[PDB]
Amino acid sequence: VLVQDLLHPTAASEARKHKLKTLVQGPRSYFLDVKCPGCLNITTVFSHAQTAVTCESCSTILCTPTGGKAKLSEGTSFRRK
Template sequence: MKELIRMPKSKFLKVVCPKCKNKQIVISKASTYVRCTVCNAELVNPKGGNAHIKGKIIAVFG
């Protein structure tokens, strides 16, 4: 059966900051740089399709 509504390929990720251990939710296909809200460290780099995640992924949503 043909899929009528396409499901998104991106997922929300709960990431731990490597510097301050703050937990933050980011998107897996981020198109902009994402920084930690506490220490301003870089968490996500955009890399064409999928983003490069610099922190540890502890949960995946979606």
């Protein structure tokens, strides 16, 4: 060391670093389009959701909160924004 590009760190290193210890901090979470077993809407769900998201016009739970990323109720199709 004693010479390194602190301004252009490798993408692998920036992915390995903690979300706050990167050069410019940013979230590691994302949003998901979940296809409900019903219809009329594609539901937007936070990856690290704290709430048991339910359908707008149904009564099935889309996700169950966990310590980190929420689950997906084991029946779901999901696209990532």
